[PDB]
Amino acid sequence: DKHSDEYKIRRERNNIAVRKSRDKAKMRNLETQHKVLELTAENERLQKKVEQLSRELSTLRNLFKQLP
Amino acid sequence: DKHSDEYKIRRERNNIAVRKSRDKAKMRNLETQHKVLELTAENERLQKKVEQLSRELSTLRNLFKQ
DNA sequence: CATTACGTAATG
DNA sequence: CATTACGTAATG
């Protein structure tokens, strides 16, 4: 059964499919890791934008009250 | 090599460690995908603030050219 | 073919 | 002990 040629071919093909499936799983993990870095960078960009608008706004609010 | 008590025990212990190591890997992967969902949720939060501030600013500039 | 539990062995 | 390449077998 294990010395039959059909078992040997069967194992050859599955071994190839296993390697391929494990390597695609790696890549999906790397992509998810890449996503964390993209969200983090865009997150940093967005809070700095919020901080700019917050400043521009708060600056104005304080000078408006600055004149009865 | 095998059939020895030495080898049977060594395998029992490695098998336990493998299972542990694979379960811990599952969880770090789980954690990483938890992180994308929080960065995504926090992203949407920050976008909506930028938009609210942008609106508040923009209405101001427009009303000033009267 | 693709996926995954389970195991072996080499290795840090 | 923990990690990982490599393989087997059951299964979708």
- Using alpha carbons, select from B62, B41, B31 the residue that is nearest to residue A33: B31
> For residue A22, what are the domain limits?
1-68
Could you tell me the CA-to-CA distances from A40 to A54, B31, B34 in Å, in that order? 21, 15, 13
User: What are the CB-based long-range contacts (under 8 Å, 24+) for A35-40?
Assistant: A35/B36, A36/B32, A36/B35, A36/B36, A36/B39, A39/B36, A39/B39, A39/B40, A39/B43, A40/B39
Q: Is A40 exposed, middle or buried (0-12, 13-18, 19+ CB in 10 A)?
A: middle
Which of 8-47 (A) contact B at CB < 8 A? 29, 32-33, 35-36, 39-40, 42-43, 46-47
Q: Establish if A56 touches chain B: CB-CB under 8 angstroms.
A: yes
- Using alpha carbons, select from A37, A18, A50, A28 the residue that is nearest to residue B53: A50
Q: What is the resolution of this structure in A?
A: 2.2
Q: What number of helices (H) and strands (E) belong to chain A?
A: 1, 0
Cβ contacts of A43 within 8 Å, gap of 6 or more:
B39, B42, B43, B46
**Is residue B25 a contact partner of residue A29, using CB atoms and an 8 Å limit?**
no
Cα A41–Cα A42–Cα A43 angle in degrees, nearest 5: 90
Contacts of A49 in chain B (CB under 8 A): 46, 50
Structurally, how many domains does chain A consist of?
1
How was it solved?
X-ray
Contacts of B33 in chain A (CB under 8 A): 32
Helix-helix angle A5-65:B5-64, to 10 degrees: 30
